[model samples]
Every structure is written in structure tokens, then in C-alpha cells.
Target: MKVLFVSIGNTCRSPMAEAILKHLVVKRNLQDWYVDSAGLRSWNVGLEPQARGQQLLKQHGLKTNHLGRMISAQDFYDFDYIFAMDNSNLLELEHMAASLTPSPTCKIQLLGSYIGRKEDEIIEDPYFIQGMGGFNAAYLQILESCERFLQHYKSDD
Candidate 1:
């Protein structure tokens, strides 16, 4: 299935999650999933992720060519699922998706809740943190949640 993973900015959490999940599925040699990430708003429109965020991916031995973009109507029709990192983004997406003439049938979920994590707890936006090293802790949380998702989904294969 095509699952679109999204967060507040395309920079910190989403790309890292994208990398880890892609890495996980590939490492296990699973090929049924197509994954991507995006930003809720166009705040970073036409810009690359901040250097700090980029470095975290690099440190993981992963490289990303992510250029931040806004959520669009096409995404609603395109992906099987769209996951937002917070309630705000989810609400915004729900509003936008509702505006589509032929409304999409795909589910929209909060990223935290999808992986069995608590939705009320925010995934700290790392770009605003003083250092990206803080992302290491956050990355581990993402990885753990994704691992849980993978374990739950992969066994069905």
C-alpha cells in the first residue's frame, strides 16, 4: 500500500521516519510498501530542510533530498493513508480533504496514534531545538514506533 507519512515540517521528524521505515522494509526485503513524507503547511515552500535536520539523516548514514512542500488535494486521492504528526495538521488535512469534489476514501490518521503511541504527546519539532543532537532521542522514539508497526504488519506477509 502507499502510505504517506507527514509532520509539521518536512525537515526533522518526517524525513527521518521516512528513512527509517524505508530502511526497515528494505532491510527485511519487503517490497509491498511505498512511502513518502510532506509538510502540513507551505512554510518551507521552495526550501530545503534546515542544516541541523539534514545532518541527523546523514548521521544515520541516510541521505535525503527533501524539498519541503505543502499538502495538496492530489495527495488525498493518491495515497492509501495520510498520517499527520499532530492534531492541528490532521484537522487541517481533514478540512482540505473534505473540500475535494469526489472525496477520497483513504484514511487520515495521527502519526503518533497509528504506531500505537499517544497522540497527546507531541513529537518535539527538532528544528527549533538548540541542536539536532536532540534529534537522536526523538529519532529513537520514531524508530521504536516504526519497529512496532513493522512487526505488526510484516508478520501478515
Candidate 2:
């Protein structure tokens, strides 16, 4: 089961999702499940996640080595699931997927959609939210959402 998480700049939310999911997958010994992340915007390409983002991941015992990368058209076909942090990115992915020839077989949706909290499905970008507050809140949310998502979806794997 290959999954891809996406965000605007790949410096925060998406990487958080990627690391959290990877942590859960490893903890469950689900080695066959591959998790990765990318950004819709290329501004941060090649950079590591933001300082606050990395700190939150470490605080939560999640991985910290993910570098920012722009989403490729091929990614639609490469992953089994594509989860966006917010509606904007999800819509961008929808357009990207629609432009593909054999379109993506991946199930695309807001990352929080799997958690079934409709109001919480759109994760706000913490890039400019000041200090660690934004990052911390996002981390907590993603942590719970990822856990719920795994509980509901992993059974299918």
C-alpha cells in the first residue's frame, strides 16, 4: 500500500502526515506499506521541513529527514492513495489527476477525510502562523487523524 501526502510547500503539513503515517506503519510492522509526501508549490523544493515542523515531529517521535519535493504528474499513478492537507491542495490534485492520460488510480481526498470529522477535514497551513503554536496544533491534529485513518484503512491492506 503506497500512500502520498500533499501540502502547499512540502515544508510542514504534508511532511508531518508522511512521518506520522510512516511511524504508525513501522510500529505495526507493516513494511509493505510505503509512505511519502510532496508539495503542490515548488517554492521550497530541496529544503528540509521548517524548523517548527521538524521540532513537532521530534516531539511526537516521528521521522525528520523528509526533504521538500514538488508533486509530479506521475505521482498520481505511483501511489495507491493521495491525501491532501487542505481543500486547496486537494483541488489542485484533482486538476492534476484529470489532466493525466490513464488518470490516477489512487484514491484522492483530504487527509482528514478518513478521520470522519467533516469540520476538521481542511487542515490549515501553519507556515505563517507564528512560533510553534501553529505547528504544534497541526501535529496533534495529524497525529490523531493519522491514527484514525490507519485504524479504518489498514484493515483493507
Give the alpha carbon lDDT tens digit for every residue of 83-102 in model 1. Answer: 77667878888998889999
lDDT of 2 by residue, 14-85 (tens): 998898888888788886798999998779999999887887777766657888999998889889889888
Clashes of each: 0, 0
TM-score of 2: 0.94
Residue pairs in clash, model 1: none
Q: Rate the local accuracy (lDDT) of all candidates.
A: 0.75, 0.86
Question: How much is the lDDT of residue 24 in candidate 2?
Answer: 85
